[PDB]
Protein backbone atom coordinates (compact mmCIF):
# COMPACT_ATOMS: atom_id res chain seq x y z
CA UNK A 1 0.00 0.00 0.00
CA UNK A 2 1.23 3.44 -0.86
CA UNK A 3 -1.75 5.41 -0.28
CA UNK A 4 -4.35 6.84 -2.60
CA UNK A 5 -2.03 8.59 -4.95
CA UNK A 6 -1.25 5.61 -7.25
CA UNK A 7 -3.73 3.11 -5.74
CA UNK A 8 -4.27 0.76 -8.68
CA UNK A 9 -6.06 2.22 -11.72
CA UNK A 10 -8.00 4.80 -9.35
CA UNK A 11 -10.26 7.70 -8.04
CA UNK A 12 -10.48 9.74 -4.84
CA UNK A 13 -13.31 11.15 -2.57
CA UNK A 14 -12.19 14.78 -3.37
CA UNK A 15 -15.07 17.21 -3.32
CA UNK A 16 -15.15 19.79 -0.53
CA UNK A 17 -17.89 22.32 0.22
CA UNK A 18 -16.73 24.97 -2.29
CA UNK A 19 -14.79 25.23 -5.45
CA UNK A 20 -13.10 28.22 -7.11
CA UNK A 21 -13.54 28.71 -10.87
CA UNK A 22 -8.84 30.76 -17.09
CA UNK A 23 -5.39 30.07 -15.83
CA UNK A 24 -2.21 32.23 -15.88
CA UNK A 25 -2.29 31.50 -19.64
CA UNK A 26 1.13 32.81 -20.53
CA UNK A 27 3.80 30.28 -19.73
CA UNK A 28 3.42 28.53 -16.39
CA UNK A 29 4.99 25.63 -18.18
CA UNK A 30 5.29 21.97 -18.63
CA UNK A 31 8.59 20.03 -19.62
CA UNK A 32 6.82 18.66 -22.78
CA UNK A 33 5.66 16.04 -20.29
CA UNK A 34 3.05 14.52 -22.56
CA UNK A 35 1.20 12.57 -19.90
CA UNK A 36 -2.57 12.96 -18.82
CA UNK A 37 -2.47 15.04 -15.74
CA UNK A 38 0.96 16.67 -16.11
CA UNK A 39 -0.27 19.17 -13.89
CA UNK A 40 2.09 17.89 -11.13
CA UNK A 41 4.75 19.68 -13.11
CA UNK A 42 2.82 23.05 -13.03
CA UNK A 43 2.00 22.30 -9.32
CA UNK A 44 5.74 22.11 -8.55
CA UNK A 45 6.21 25.24 -10.62
CA UNK A 46 3.35 27.01 -8.82
CA UNK A 47 4.76 25.86 -5.51
CA UNK A 48 8.21 27.02 -6.38
CA UNK A 49 6.89 30.51 -7.42
CA UNK A 50 5.32 30.80 -3.99
CA UNK A 51 8.68 29.67 -2.55
CA UNK A 52 10.47 32.53 -4.25
CA UNK A 53 7.70 34.93 -3.65
CA UNK A 54 7.63 33.95 0.03
CA UNK A 55 11.43 34.15 0.44
CA UNK A 56 11.71 37.58 -1.19
CA UNK A 57 9.09 38.79 1.27
CA UNK A 58 10.58 37.05 4.39
CA UNK A 59 14.13 38.16 3.48
CA UNK A 60 13.04 41.73 3.18
CA UNK A 61 11.35 41.49 6.61
CA UNK A 62 14.54 39.93 8.01
CA UNK A 63 17.56 41.97 8.85
CA UNK A 64 20.33 41.11 6.25
CA UNK A 65 22.69 39.64 8.90
CA UNK A 66 20.26 37.07 10.10
CA UNK A 67 19.98 33.60 8.78
CA UNK A 68 16.75 32.52 7.10
CA UNK A 69 15.79 28.85 6.47
CA UNK A 70 12.27 27.52 5.73
CA UNK A 71 10.74 24.66 3.75
CA UNK A 72 8.44 26.33 1.22
CA UNK A 73 7.09 22.84 0.47
CA UNK A 74 6.06 22.49 4.17
CA UNK A 75 4.35 25.84 3.98
CA UNK A 76 2.46 25.00 0.72
CA UNK A 77 1.36 21.60 2.05
CA UNK A 78 0.00 22.83 5.39
CA UNK A 79 -1.99 25.58 3.78
CA UNK A 80 -3.30 23.49 0.87
CA UNK A 81 -4.53 21.20 3.70
CA UNK A 82 -6.43 24.24 5.16
CA UNK A 83 -7.81 25.28 1.70
CA UNK A 84 -9.87 22.09 1.91
CA UNK A 85 -12.10 23.77 4.51
CA UNK A 86 -12.02 27.22 2.94
CA UNK A 87 -14.69 28.79 0.95
CA UNK A 88 -15.82 31.83 -0.99
CA UNK A 89 -13.05 34.52 -0.79
CA UNK A 90 -10.79 32.76 1.64
CA UNK A 91 -10.47 30.17 -1.11
CA UNK A 92 -9.89 32.78 -3.92
CA UNK A 93 -6.99 34.06 -1.80
CA UNK A 94 -5.48 30.69 -0.84
CA UNK A 95 -5.53 29.80 -4.58
CA UNK A 96 -4.09 33.17 -5.45
CA UNK A 97 -1.28 33.56 -2.88
CA UNK A 98 0.01 30.08 -3.00
CA UNK A 99 -0.17 30.33 -6.82
CA UNK A 100 -2.53 27.24 -7.02
CA UNK A 101 -4.51 29.22 -9.66
CA UNK A 102 -1.60 28.65 -12.02
CA UNK A 103 -2.15 24.82 -12.27
CA UNK A 104 -4.13 24.28 -15.45
CA UNK A 105 -7.32 22.90 -14.25
CA UNK A 106 -10.56 24.77 -14.08
CA UNK A 107 -11.41 23.87 -10.46
CA UNK A 108 -9.89 24.21 -7.04
CA UNK A 109 -11.06 20.72 -6.03
CA UNK A 110 -8.53 19.29 -8.43
CA UNK A 111 -5.42 20.78 -6.82
CA UNK A 112 -5.81 18.47 -3.85
CA UNK A 113 -5.52 15.43 -6.11
CA UNK A 114 -2.45 16.84 -7.77
CA UNK A 115 -0.85 17.48 -4.30
CA UNK A 116 -1.23 13.79 -3.34
CA UNK A 117 0.17 12.91 -6.73
CA UNK A 118 3.34 15.05 -6.18
CA UNK A 119 3.63 13.93 -2.49
CA UNK A 120 3.51 10.18 -3.39
CA UNK A 121 6.09 10.98 -6.15
CA UNK A 122 8.27 12.59 -3.42
CA UNK A 123 8.39 10.71 -0.11
CA UNK A 124 8.77 7.35 -1.96
CA UNK A 125 10.79 4.39 -0.89
CA UNK A 126 14.28 5.17 -1.94
CA UNK A 127 16.54 2.51 -0.46
CA UNK A 128 19.69 4.31 -1.64
CA UNK A 129 18.94 7.99 -2.06
CA UNK A 130 18.23 9.70 1.24
CA UNK A 131 15.47 10.08 3.79
CA UNK A 132 12.91 12.69 2.55
CA UNK A 133 9.83 11.99 4.74
CA UNK A 134 6.52 13.93 5.75
CA UNK A 135 3.79 13.55 8.41
CA UNK A 136 0.62 15.60 8.53
CA UNK A 137 -1.86 15.44 11.37
CA UNK A 138 -4.96 17.35 12.25
CA UNK A 139 -5.36 17.70 16.07
CA UNK A 140 -8.75 19.24 17.09
CA UNK A 141 -10.48 20.06 20.37
CA UNK A 142 -12.24 16.86 21.59
CA UNK A 143 -15.40 18.77 22.08
CA UNK A 144 -16.09 19.68 18.45
CA UNK A 145 -17.61 17.17 16.06
CA UNK A 146 -15.48 17.73 12.97
CA UNK A 147 -16.72 17.41 9.43
CA UNK A 148 -16.65 13.77 8.32
CA UNK A 149 -15.71 14.32 4.63
CA UNK A 150 -13.04 16.85 5.77
CA UNK A 151 -11.68 14.24 8.09
CA UNK A 152 -11.50 11.80 5.24
CA UNK A 153 -10.18 13.80 2.17
CA UNK A 154 -7.41 14.57 4.72
CA UNK A 155 -6.83 10.79 5.49
CA UNK A 156 -6.67 10.03 1.79
CA UNK A 157 -5.01 12.97 0.06
CA UNK A 158 -2.68 14.15 2.91
CA UNK A 159 -2.41 11.32 5.32
CA UNK A 160 -3.60 13.53 8.09
CA UNK A 161 -5.18 11.61 10.94
CA UNK A 162 -7.55 13.49 13.29
CA UNK A 163 -6.18 13.30 16.87
CA UNK A 164 -8.38 14.59 19.75
CA UNK A 165 -6.71 16.71 22.33
CA UNK A 166 -8.44 18.70 25.10
CA UNK A 167 -7.63 22.14 23.88
CA UNK A 168 -10.61 23.58 25.68
CA UNK A 169 -9.53 22.50 29.14
CA UNK A 170 -6.05 21.37 29.11
CA UNK A 171 -4.61 23.54 26.31
CA UNK A 172 -1.09 24.15 27.81
CA UNK A 173 -0.76 20.45 28.16
CA UNK A 174 -2.20 20.11 24.62
CA UNK A 175 0.55 22.42 23.30
CA UNK A 176 3.17 20.06 24.78
CA UNK A 177 1.58 17.04 23.02
CA UNK A 178 1.56 18.57 19.53
CA UNK A 179 5.00 20.10 19.98
CA UNK A 180 6.40 16.72 20.88
CA UNK A 181 4.62 14.95 17.96
CA UNK A 182 6.54 17.38 15.70
CA UNK A 183 9.78 16.49 17.60
CA UNK A 184 9.26 12.83 17.00
CA UNK A 185 8.26 13.27 13.38
CA UNK A 186 11.44 15.31 12.64
CA UNK A 187 13.93 13.05 14.48
CA UNK A 188 14.01 15.37 17.48
CA UNK A 189 15.15 18.37 15.42
CA UNK A 190 12.22 20.68 15.09
CA UNK A 191 11.64 20.94 18.72
CA UNK A 192 8.86 23.09 20.20
CA UNK A 193 7.45 25.03 17.39
CA UNK A 194 4.25 26.21 18.99
CA UNK A 195 5.11 29.09 21.33
CA UNK A 196 3.76 29.16 24.97
CA UNK A 197 0.36 30.79 24.60
CA UNK A 198 -0.39 30.05 20.97
CA UNK A 199 -3.05 27.37 21.93
CA UNK A 200 -5.82 28.01 24.48
CA UNK A 201 -9.47 28.00 25.48
CA UNK A 202 -10.66 28.69 21.93
CA UNK A 203 -8.37 26.76 19.56
CA UNK A 204 -10.59 24.51 17.40
CA UNK A 205 -8.14 22.58 15.22
CA UNK A 206 -4.31 22.78 15.22
CA UNK A 207 -3.12 21.23 11.94
CA UNK A 208 0.57 20.29 11.63
CA UNK A 209 2.86 19.34 8.73
CA UNK A 210 6.48 18.12 8.92
CA UNK A 211 9.35 17.36 6.49
CA UNK A 212 12.67 15.69 7.48
CA UNK A 213 15.64 14.94 5.15
CA UNK A 214 19.06 13.28 5.78
CA UNK A 215 21.41 12.74 2.97
CA UNK A 216 25.02 11.73 2.55
CA UNK A 217 27.07 13.67 0.04
CA UNK A 218 27.98 11.77 -3.10
CA UNK A 219 31.42 13.33 -2.98
CA UNK A 220 32.08 13.34 0.87
CA UNK A 221 34.43 15.80 2.61
CA UNK A 222 37.40 14.65 4.65
CA UNK A 223 37.50 15.57 8.33
CA UNK A 224 41.22 16.35 7.85
CA UNK A 225 40.74 18.95 5.16
CA UNK A 226 38.64 20.84 7.64
CA UNK A 227 40.55 23.84 8.76
CA UNK A 228 39.14 26.79 10.65
CA UNK A 229 38.78 29.86 8.36
CA UNK A 230 37.26 33.28 8.54
CA UNK A 231 33.73 33.74 7.38
CA UNK A 232 33.27 37.40 6.57
CA UNK A 233 29.82 38.03 7.98
CA UNK A 234 26.99 39.76 6.34
CA UNK A 235 27.73 42.95 8.35
CA UNK A 236 31.47 43.06 7.38
CA UNK A 237 32.46 41.56 10.78
CA UNK A 238 33.87 38.03 10.86
CA UNK A 239 33.93 34.84 12.80
CA UNK A 240 35.93 31.65 12.82
CA UNK A 241 34.09 28.68 11.27
CA UNK A 242 35.15 25.03 10.69
CA UNK A 243 35.52 25.28 6.91
CA UNK A 244 35.30 22.17 4.86
CA UNK A 245 37.36 21.74 1.67
CA UNK A 246 37.51 19.22 -1.20
CA UNK A 247 38.45 19.11 -4.90
CA UNK A 248 35.84 17.57 -7.19
CA UNK A 249 33.90 17.52 -10.38
CA UNK A 250 30.47 19.18 -9.71
CA UNK A 251 27.80 20.96 -11.88
CA UNK A 252 28.62 24.76 -11.94
CA UNK A 253 28.31 28.02 -13.94
CA UNK A 254 29.11 31.67 -13.08
CA UNK A 255 25.82 33.20 -13.84
CA UNK A 256 24.29 36.74 -14.11
CA UNK A 257 26.42 39.27 -12.39
CA UNK A 258 29.02 36.57 -11.45
CA UNK A 259 26.78 34.82 -9.03
CA UNK A 260 28.32 31.37 -8.78
CA UNK A 261 25.79 28.45 -8.57
CA UNK A 262 27.18 25.08 -7.35
CA UNK A 263 25.04 21.88 -7.27
CA UNK A 264 26.41 19.23 -4.77
CA UNK A 265 24.21 16.05 -5.15
CA UNK A 266 23.43 13.73 -2.40
CA UNK A 267 23.73 9.92 -2.46
CA UNK A 268 22.29 8.72 -5.75
CA UNK A 269 21.44 11.95 -7.60
CA UNK A 270 17.66 12.52 -6.62
CA UNK A 271 18.05 15.44 -4.17
CA UNK A 272 20.83 18.09 -4.52
CA UNK A 273 21.96 21.17 -2.51
CA UNK A 274 22.31 24.31 -4.76
CA UNK A 275 24.54 27.10 -3.32
CA UNK A 276 24.39 30.55 -4.75
CA UNK A 277 27.56 32.35 -3.70
CA UNK A 278 27.24 35.85 -5.37
CA UNK A 279 30.44 37.88 -6.16
CA UNK A 280 32.33 39.88 -3.58
CA UNK A 281 31.32 43.26 -4.95
CA UNK A 282 27.59 42.39 -5.07
CA UNK A 283 25.28 42.07 -2.12
CA UNK A 284 23.23 38.92 -1.62
CA UNK A 285 20.32 41.36 -1.11
CA UNK A 286 20.28 42.21 -4.83
CA UNK A 287 20.18 38.50 -5.82
CA UNK A 288 17.49 37.94 -3.23
CA UNK A 289 15.50 40.86 -4.60
CA UNK A 290 15.44 39.61 -8.20
CA UNK A 291 14.81 35.95 -7.68
CA UNK A 292 12.31 34.58 -10.04
CA UNK A 293 11.62 30.75 -10.21
CA UNK A 294 11.87 31.20 -13.96
CA UNK A 295 15.47 31.87 -13.46
CA UNK A 296 15.72 27.97 -13.61
CA UNK A 297 18.20 28.87 -16.45
CA UNK A 298 20.69 29.43 -13.59
CA UNK A 299 20.07 25.89 -12.29
CA UNK A 300 19.63 23.91 -15.56
CA UNK A 301 22.45 25.79 -17.43
CA UNK A 302 25.17 24.45 -15.17
CA UNK A 303 25.04 21.06 -16.82
CA UNK A 304 28.65 21.35 -17.28
CA UNK A 305 30.61 19.20 -14.86
CA UNK A 306 33.32 21.53 -13.69
CA UNK A 307 36.34 20.86 -11.49
CA UNK A 308 36.00 23.00 -8.42
CA UNK A 309 38.19 23.36 -5.37
CA UNK A 310 35.26 23.95 -2.91
CA UNK A 311 35.47 25.64 0.48
CA UNK A 312 32.22 25.48 2.57
CA UNK A 313 31.52 26.01 6.37
CA UNK A 314 30.04 23.20 8.22
CA UNK A 315 27.29 24.90 10.20
CA UNK A 316 23.99 24.40 11.90
CA UNK A 317 21.22 27.02 11.46
CA UNK A 318 17.83 26.66 13.12
CA UNK A 319 15.00 29.27 12.51
CA UNK A 320 11.32 29.91 13.23
CA UNK A 321 8.89 32.75 12.40
CA UNK A 322 5.22 33.60 11.83
CA UNK A 323 3.95 32.96 8.45
CA UNK A 324 0.92 35.16 9.32
CA UNK A 325 2.96 38.41 8.94
CA UNK A 326 4.29 37.68 5.45
CA UNK A 327 1.22 35.89 4.00
CA UNK A 328 -0.91 38.91 4.88
CA UNK A 329 1.57 41.01 2.93
CA UNK A 330 1.43 38.42 0.14
CA UNK A 331 -2.29 39.00 -0.02
CA UNK A 332 -3.74 36.24 2.09
CA UNK A 333 -5.92 38.58 4.20
CA UNK A 334 -9.41 37.16 4.68
CA UNK A 335 -8.15 33.87 6.19
CA UNK A 336 -6.89 35.45 9.37
CA UNK A 337 -9.70 37.92 10.10
CA UNK A 338 -12.43 36.42 12.37
CA UNK A 339 -14.50 38.99 10.53
CA UNK A 340 -13.72 37.84 6.99
CA UNK A 341 -12.56 34.26 7.37
CA UNK A 342 -14.80 31.76 5.72
CA UNK A 343 -14.08 28.10 6.46
CA UNK A 344 -17.35 25.90 6.53
CA UNK A 345 -15.70 22.57 5.61
CA UNK A 346 -13.84 22.05 8.89
CA UNK A 347 -16.56 21.82 11.63
CA UNK A 348 -19.91 20.07 11.25
CA UNK A 349 -21.75 21.04 14.43
CA UNK A 350 -20.81 24.75 14.43
CA UNK A 351 -19.46 25.16 10.83
CA UNK A 352 -18.92 28.96 10.73
CA UNK A 353 -16.81 31.49 12.71
CA UNK A 354 -13.48 29.67 12.29
CA UNK A 355 -10.41 31.68 11.38
CA UNK A 356 -6.61 31.07 11.40
CA UNK A 357 -5.50 32.80 14.57
CA UNK A 358 -1.69 32.26 14.05
CA UNK A 359 0.59 30.20 11.84
CA UNK A 360 4.13 29.01 12.71
CA UNK A 361 7.09 27.42 10.99
CA UNK A 362 10.50 26.32 12.46
CA UNK A 363 13.33 24.81 10.41
CA UNK A 364 16.77 23.20 10.82
CA UNK A 365 19.84 22.49 8.74
CA UNK A 366 23.15 20.76 9.69
CA UNK A 367 25.53 20.65 6.70
CA UNK A 368 28.77 18.97 7.51
CA UNK A 369 31.54 16.66 6.35
CA UNK A 370 29.36 13.55 5.56
CA UNK A 371 26.11 15.11 4.38
CA UNK A 372 23.20 17.18 5.77
CA UNK A 373 20.09 16.82 7.79
CA UNK A 374 17.29 19.40 7.17
CA UNK A 375 13.99 19.41 9.00
CA UNK A 376 10.94 21.68 8.95
CA UNK A 377 7.49 22.16 10.44
CA UNK A 378 4.47 24.41 10.00
CA UNK A 379 1.46 24.49 12.24
CA UNK A 380 -1.34 26.73 11.33
CA UNK A 381 -3.64 26.89 14.38
CA UNK A 382 -7.36 27.70 13.81
CA UNK A 383 -9.88 29.19 16.29
CA UNK A 384 -13.37 30.60 16.89
CA UNK A 385 -15.23 27.48 18.08
CA UNK A 386 -18.29 26.72 15.93
CA UNK A 387 41.17 24.49 -10.04
CA UNK A 388 38.56 27.28 -10.49
CA UNK A 389 37.62 27.63 -6.75
CA UNK A 390 34.30 28.51 -5.05
CA UNK A 391 35.09 29.71 -1.56
CA UNK A 392 31.77 30.24 0.22
CA UNK A 393 33.08 32.11 3.26
CA UNK A 394 30.58 34.92 3.20
CA UNK A 395 26.70 34.75 3.14
CA UNK A 396 25.17 32.64 0.47
CA UNK A 397 21.76 31.22 -0.20
CA UNK A 398 20.99 27.51 -0.09
CA UNK A 399 18.39 25.57 -2.08
CA UNK A 400 17.70 21.79 -1.58
CA UNK A 401 16.00 20.62 -4.81
CA UNK A 402 14.49 17.27 -5.56
CA UNK A 403 15.66 17.23 -9.16
CA UNK A 404 13.30 14.71 -10.69
CA UNK A 405 10.21 16.61 -9.60
CA UNK A 406 11.88 20.02 -9.27
CA UNK A 407 10.53 21.06 -5.87
CA UNK A 408 12.47 23.46 -3.68
CA UNK A 409 12.18 21.31 -0.53
CA UNK A 410 14.10 23.85 1.68
CA UNK A 411 15.63 27.31 1.07
CA UNK A 412 17.84 29.46 3.30
CA UNK A 413 20.43 32.20 3.61
CA UNK A 414 23.22 31.02 5.87
CA UNK A 415 24.51 34.42 6.81
CA UNK A 416 26.06 33.57 10.14
CA UNK A 417 27.42 30.04 10.33
CA UNK A 418 29.12 30.26 13.68
CA UNK A 419 25.76 29.58 15.42
CA UNK A 420 24.57 26.29 16.87
From Swiss-Prot:
Glycosylation sites: 88, 127, 147, 184
Residues the UniProt record annotates as site (Reactive bond): 385-386
Gene Ontology cellular-component terms listed: extracellular space
Biological role stated in the UniProt entry: Most important serine protease inhibitor in plasma that regulates the blood coagulation cascade. AT-III inhibits thrombin, matriptase-3/TMPRSS7, as well as factors IXa, Xa and XIa. Its inhibitory activity is greatly enhanced in the presence of heparin.
Binding site for heparin: 41, 121, 137
Annotated SUPFAM superfamilies: Serpins
GO MF term (any one): serine-type endopeptidase inhibitor activity
InterPro entries in UniProt: Antithrombin_3_serpin_domain, Serpin_dom, Serpin_fam, Serpin_sf, Serpin_sf_1, Serpin_sf_2
Taxonomic source organism: Bos taurus (Bovine)
Tissue expression summary: Plasma.
Compartment(s): Secreted, Extracellular space
Pfam entry (one): Serpin
Complex and partners: Forms protease inhibiting heterodimer with TMPRSS7.
Annotated S-S bridges: 5-120, 18-87, 239-418
Similarity remark: Belongs to the serpin family.
Designated name of the protein: Antithrombin-III
Predominant localisation class: secreted
Keywords for this protein: Blood coagulation, Disulfide bond, Glycoprotein, Hemostasis, Heparin-binding, Phosphoprotein, Protease inhibitor, Secreted, Serine protease inhibitor, Signal
Name of the gene this protein is made from: SERPINC1
Keyword Disulfide bond in record: yes
